[PDB]
Each structure stands twice: as C-alpha cells, then as structure tokens.
Amino acid sequence: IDLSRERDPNFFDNADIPVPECFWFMFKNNVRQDAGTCYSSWKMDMKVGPNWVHIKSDDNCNLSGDFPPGWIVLGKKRPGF
C-alpha cells in the first residue's frame, strides 16, 4: 500500500492533551476503511473488522498487531513530528 497517495485522516487535535504523532490508516484488501491519529511509542485496542487487535506503535509510528486476514492498520509519522 502506497501511503504517499493517501489523503490525510480527517482529525481534530485536542488542545488539552498532547498531540498524537502518528496517522493510522485501516484497510481491508486494498480498500481504505477509515483513518485517524494515534500516539507513537504506545498502545491501543482497536476493532479491526471482526476482531479486536492490540496495536503497538514504535517511535517511528510503525504499527504492530495480530490483524485478521486481509486487514491491516498502517502508521505514518505526521509531518513536523
């Protein structure tokens, strides 16, 4: 998947809390489902189609998890972060 050709997520940076460093993009096969923001060097539980996935992010916004077949959540460091 070529993230360079993906439109940015439609996000709202909350002023009261630290700004999340990463964009995430969820796909089934080649098809974008949704996108958002998340923290680097962190963890979240996210529902990915029919399964919860525990997603870990590294310092560079690479996302790791046990994704169900055909699905992925891909991370990118935000510009300026």
Partner: peptide, 17 residues
C-alpha cells in the same frame, strides 16, 4: 467526559477523551 469531537473519513468517528 472532558471533550468530544466528530472526525473520520465519513465524519462518523466520535472521539471522546
């Protein structure tokens, strides 16, 4: 609840902090 926003590709993400 401290804050809520609507976001996402379909504007159907409800982000709650």
């Amino acid at each position: 609840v401290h804050s809520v926003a609507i976001a996402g590709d379909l504007r159907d993400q409800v982000v709650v902090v």
